[PDB]
């Protein structure tokens, strides 16, 4: 596997496509995002910490919408996130114009992942080094999927990508009861990030979206501040 690490179209002697793995390293070393599916909806969180006060925290939002009922959270090379979202909104849109119903979250990831897999079949295109968490509330059941640079889309109930992900998962499996409600879920989601965010959880440092029955929405700085104050 030593010399086969580079090319994404040459199987290693052990049948290991290494380059996809190294891309997954770029995900495993990115901003921590946490997802929890409460029986009332889907809650996503990620730390939007800038490198200095010179930044305008509200400029770039990580927890984002695709349609009215789907949103994304990423842990990896940012700019590679944006190219993903646009092909996501377009894909979410291209579904609407053809079928006229909001794209089921299963299909969107099936085609937001199939977007990823396109770049991992030829030499001359780097894999999308940003794992994605997709929340949606369709057909009356909250959904939380993770699409990876490798092209495989999971069906996570609650996970966390990015730095210190192993610890985050351990906090879950601990404080995750399949029978929570969205209100409690937000507290758990914030806490899971709290295990790694190196600092006070300022309202311009953590960005949270709630995928409930009515639709996904990036929480305004205050409401999180209402939430963050309670947890602290």
């Amino acid at each position: 596997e030593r010399g086969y690490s580079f090319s994404l179209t040459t199987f290693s002697p052990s049948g290991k496509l290494v380059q996809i793995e190294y891309a997954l390293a770029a995900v495993a070393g990115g901003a921590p995002s946490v997802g929890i599916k409460a029986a009332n909806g889907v809650v996503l969180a990620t730390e939007k910490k800038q490198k200095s006060i010179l930044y305008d925290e509200r400029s770039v939002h990580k927890v984002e919408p695709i349609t009215k009922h789907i949103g994304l959270v990423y842990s990896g090379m940012g700019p590679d996130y944006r190219v993903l979202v646009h092909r996501a909104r377009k894909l979410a849109q291209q579904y609407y114009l053809v079928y006229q119903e909001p794209i089921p979250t299963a299909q969107l990831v099936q085609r937001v992942a199939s977007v990823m897999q396109e770049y991992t079949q030829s030499g001359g295109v780097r894999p999308f080094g940003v794992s994605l968490l997709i929340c949606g509330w369709n057909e009356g059941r909250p959904y939380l999927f993770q699409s990876d640079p490798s092209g495989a889309y999971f069906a996570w109930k609650a996970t966390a990508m990015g730095k210190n992900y192993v610890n985050g998962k351990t906090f879950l499996e601990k404080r995750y009861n399949e029978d929570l409600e969205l209100e409690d879920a937000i507290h758990t989601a914030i806490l899971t990030l709290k295990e790694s965010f190196e600092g006070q959880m300022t309202e311009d440092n953590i960005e949270v979206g709630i995928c409930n029955e009515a639709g996904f929405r990036r929480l305004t700085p205050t409401e999180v501040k209402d939430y963050l104050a309670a947890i602290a």
Binding site: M77, G78, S196, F197, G199
Partner: protein
């Protein structure tokens, strides 16, 4: 002929630790920072029996660590070491020794013979902003 001579070393290591010539009362202490790259034969219960793990100090070991590095330093009574041992940042042991060894160096520069609370915060922001470079696009 190079990876072969690194392997001739590990095997010569393996063969004396638990091999035909059993030694009496020769204990071997080994330290590594990875713990998974190590060959499975050198982690098999018999050569390196106890695989002690040294995890990053929690909110408690950091207190004990602070109390021993500083208990020799001259700290001005207003320095509440519990104000810095609670900050969530995952400082490591060198970093706690650092946040202290350089903390005093800031006091020494100003010719003050007592480390004051002001320096520790000036020290505390230098031994933990380790990103610095980053590039902002790996996030």
């Amino acid at each position: 002929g190079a990876d072969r001579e690194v392997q001739r070393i590990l095997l010569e290591l393996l063969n004396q630790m638990d091999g035909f010539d059993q030694n009496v009362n020769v204990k071997v202490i080994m330290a590594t920072n990875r713990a998974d790259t190590l060959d499975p034969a050198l982690l098999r219960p018999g050569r390196l029996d106890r695989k002690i793990e040294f995890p990053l100090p929690d909110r408690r070991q950091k207190r004990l660590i602070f109390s021993t590095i500083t208990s020799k330093m001259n700290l001005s009574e207003e320095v509440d070491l519990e104000d810095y041992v609670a900050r969530p940042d995952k400082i490591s042991g060198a970093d706690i020794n650092s946040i202290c060894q350089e903390s005093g160096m800031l006091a020494v520069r100003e010719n003050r013979y007592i480390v004051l609370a002001k320096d520790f915060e000036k020290a505390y922001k230098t031994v933990i902003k380790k990103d610095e470079q980053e590039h902002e696009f790996y996030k």
